[PDB]
Design a protein around this ligand. Structure first.
Ligand SMILES: [Zn+2]
Lengths: 48, 49, 406, 149, 97
DNA sequence: TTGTATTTATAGCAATTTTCGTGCCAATTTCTGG
DNA sequence: CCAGAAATTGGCACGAAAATTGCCTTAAATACAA
């Protein structure tokens, strides 16, 4: 509903098709936070 | 794209805060590089650093 | 008699630089001379034509291959809604060897019926046919317009209106209605969704009319200036080393020379602008058609400079007037003679030709000979070939390509 | 305010917790009807590709959408407008000095006015309605005034 | 194959933990795609990003989808191509994020 | 007192290239009279 | 109706005018030492 770019489109397409299911995905604000923290000289990353 | 410019009426683009900080850092770094290459007196390079 | 020291050539080269280039050069010289110095929003996402097309594609029952073909087709659509590549390029971009040109044709035809209708058309004829295919059969002149669009469009663009009668076997009553129906369509279906912003320029000099006379002044928001760093200048005296003193003295000398050169450039530009404004005064009062035919030698004599200096100064500098923004070289033009004795500027002639063409009879547009005859009543005496050249410069079609059905 | 005939009693829960029950005669007599006035502004500026013009010739739109504009491209006084209606017609010039054969064909078929022109007209925002009661025009000194001014 | 290319840009990264540590200069250099050398942002004459600036297209990516800065390569058939004139990759414009 | 070094002041000349209006004339379009 | 005549258009050519571009380290004012 807020900030998953692919999830919004997939949910809208599924709703128009009568399939009430979602693929959650990853919020974009978390990626923005990761980039901002990396810009401070700190190595933060997701693993596995 | 995480630090965009401000497009306003009249074609003015102005600036953002992060962009201003980056510009100041880049200007200081370039001046220090040129002074170090030119073998400037230490009294000026210390202030530049 | 002029000694070309490598710094006089630097002062001369500074005249012909625009404000942006001058600022870049000032920054470059500023980062090398220590004694020189200078005195949350995020936005919104806007929907374009391609975003709308992809939104419609995602809500269309396509297969995976058809969806990839649709993505390729929507990618190659410009602002006006026309397909910018042949279908062979799309087929190559697909990268699969099991797809024929027919599937791409079917996908393109499906896409062409999106909103707006006629988008992703190959050319004007295809777009017009697509738009016409969505009309109900009750349209009074659908068939004649369809025939004209499908078969004979080149001679319709040539404004024949006579061979069209012979080939289509019609009359003026029906042909005019068919042409009006054709002209009622949308040549650019993709301009329904418009995005962007106009681009502006920052003038170098401003001219106003105050107390009944024209005043010219440099624009203070863009005039370049530099300043002497006093902190490092206070160290010019002995600092327990002779090399430091020599370095400071040389850099201070160079900085002072650069500041003097900048001030001289600004003064020269202001004087040239004042002379230009004084020479062309009727233009700022009554617009065009009153331009005087002045050249570089005319300005170079009122300021006691050389023609080369005037040529260098007036390069890529803009003047703002109550009429608009000009390039400061738009005021220099050629001339033709005059019956009463004098000269007429080519800008005035172009304006007069535009005004005369804009108010002619649509049934019988004026030719170049008629325009020359009309101009030879005010005492201009301009050649027919020159009138044709002016009309071509104005991008106005010839007489046989300007007539309507009246 | 207004003097209203009022009774203090519960009425079927329609005045539960500060709720107010109002008779239809109050609505019919327009005792609490108010007038609200909104202002919209359209600015024509100067660009590098010529100046923007306030004009009645918007080539892409139809004849009906220009029915409430006068000869100067401004909405009439007293017109009833709703969301999406054009108030002031303005065009932004787009400039290119090269004419491709497709552009030449378009200019020949549909005229040169449709080309090298964009649309930047002032329109009523969605969800806004009302009657045009006043129009004011401010023009820079030295610029020719239109008929409305 | 365009189908796999389109399917491979909507994939979801898999993870189960978050790691934080200090950044080495070599790590910082491996993060970057280029070096910023000039404080300019927009040319203000062509309204295009200046080279080696804070918005340079050679470093951070194209300003338009699948188009290089000069314009030699413009469509999806040239995806992944590095232009020899401007140095801008032919890819999506979201890589600037 | 003056001879000499240091600081200002010096943005023109003279080739060289580009643009100007306008004639020449073949190709293309319109017109008129039998 | 036909076709030749008449008119229209623009590419090419031409000399003059106009605009552009390279030049390479000078002379005169003035403060200071002898
Ligand atoms: Zn490129």
């Amino acid at each position: 509903k807020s900030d998953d770019v692919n999830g919004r489109t997939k949910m809208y397409k599924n709703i128009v098709d009568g399939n009430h299911q979602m693929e959650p995905g990853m919020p974009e604000s978390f990626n923005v936070l990761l980039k901002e923290i990396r810009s401070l000289g700190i190595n933060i990353e997701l693993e596995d | 794209d995480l630090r965009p410019l401000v497009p306003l009426d009249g074609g003015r683009f102005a600036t953002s805060d992060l962009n201003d900080l980056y510009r100041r850092v880049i200007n200081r770094n370039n001046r220090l590089k040129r002074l170090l290459d030119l073998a400037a007196p230490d009294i000026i390079v210390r202030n530049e650093k | 008699q002029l000694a070309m020291t490598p710094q006089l050539q630097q002062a001369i080269r500074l005249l012909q630089l625009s404000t942006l280039e001058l600022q870049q050069e000032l920054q470059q010289a500023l980062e090398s001379n220590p004694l020189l110095e200078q005195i949350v929003y995020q936005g919104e996402t806007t929907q374009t034509l391609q975003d709308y097309l992809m939104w419609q594609v995602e809500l269309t029952p396509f297969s995976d291959t058809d969806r990839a073909i649709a993505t390729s087709i929507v990618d190659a659509v410009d602002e006006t809604g026309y397909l910018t590549v042949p279908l062979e390029d799309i087929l190559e971009s697909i990268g699969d060897e099991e797809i024929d040109i027919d599937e791409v044709e079917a996908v393109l035809k499906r896409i062409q019926r999106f909103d707006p209708v006629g988008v992703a058309a190959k050319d004007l004829r295809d777009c017009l046919l697509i738009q016409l295919s969505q009309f109900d059969k009750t349209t009074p002149w659908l068939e004649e317009a369809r025939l004209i669009i499908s078969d004979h469009l080149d001679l319709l663009a040539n404004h024949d209106f006579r061979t069209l009668m012979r080939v289509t076997r019609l009359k003026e009553d029906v042909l005019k209605e068919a042409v009006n129906l054709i002209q009622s369509l949308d040549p650019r279906p993709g301009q329904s969704i418009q995005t962007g912003e106009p681009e502006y320029v920052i003038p170098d000099v401003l001219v106003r009319k105050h107390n009944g006379h024209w005043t010219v002044e440099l624009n203070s928001d863009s005039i370049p200036r530099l300043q002497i760093n006093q902190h490092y200048a206070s160290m010019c005296n002995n600092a327990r080393n002779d090399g430091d003193s020599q370095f400071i003295r040389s850099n201070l000398q160079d900085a002072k020379w650069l500041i003097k050169s900048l001030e001289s450039r600004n003064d020269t530009l202001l004087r040239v602008s004042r002379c230009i404004v004084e020479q062309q005064q009727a233009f700022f009062e009554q617009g065009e058609e009153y331009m005087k035919p002045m050249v570089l030698a005319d300005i170079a004599q009122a300021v006691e400079m050389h023609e080369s200096t005037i040529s260098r100064v007036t390069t890529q500098k803009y003047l703002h007037s109550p009429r608009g923004i000009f390039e400061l070289k738009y005021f220099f033009s050629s001339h033709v003679n005059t019956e009463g004795g004098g000269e007429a500027s080519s800008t005035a002639i172009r304006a007069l030709v535009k005004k005369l063409i804009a108010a002619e009879n649509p049934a019988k547009p004026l030719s170049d000979s008629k325009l020359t005859s009309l101009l030879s009543e005010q005492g201009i005496m301009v050649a027919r070939r020159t009138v044709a050249k002016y009309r071509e410069s104005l991008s106005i079609p010839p007489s046989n390509q300007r007539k309507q059905l009246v | 305010g207004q003097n209203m005939r009022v009774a203090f009693m519960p009425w079927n829960g329609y005045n539960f917790e500060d709720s107010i029950l109002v008779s239809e005669r109050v609505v019919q007599e327009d005792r609490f009807t108010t007038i609200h006035i909104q202002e919209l502004a359209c600015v024509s500026r100067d660009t590098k590709l010529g100046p923007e013009e306030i004009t009645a010739d918007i080539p892409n739109v139809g004849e009906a959408a220009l029915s409430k504009l006068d000869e100067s491209g401004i909405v009439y006084i007293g017109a009833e407008v709703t969301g999406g209606d054009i108030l002031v017609g303005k065009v932004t010039p787009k400039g290119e000095t090269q004419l491709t054969p497709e552009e030449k064909l378009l200019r020949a078929i549909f005229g040169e006015k449709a080309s090298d022109v964009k649309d930047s007209s002032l329109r009523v925002p969605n969800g806004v309605s009302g009657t045009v009661i006043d129009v004011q025009v401010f023009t820079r000194d030295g610029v020719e005034k239109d008929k409305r001014a | 194959d365009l189908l796999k290319f389109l399917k491979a840009q909507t994939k979801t990264e898999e993870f189960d933990a978050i790691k934080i540590a200090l950044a080495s200069p070599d790590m910082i250099r491996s993060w970057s795609f280029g070096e910023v050398k000039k404080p300019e942002t927009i040319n203000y004459r062509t309204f295009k990003p200046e080279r080696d600036g804070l918005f340079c297209a050679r470093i951070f990516g194209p300003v338009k989808d699948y188009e290089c800065l000069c314009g030699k390569y413009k469509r999806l058939k040239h995806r992944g191509v590095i232009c020899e004139k401007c140095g801008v990759e032919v890819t999506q414009t979201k890589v600037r994020r």
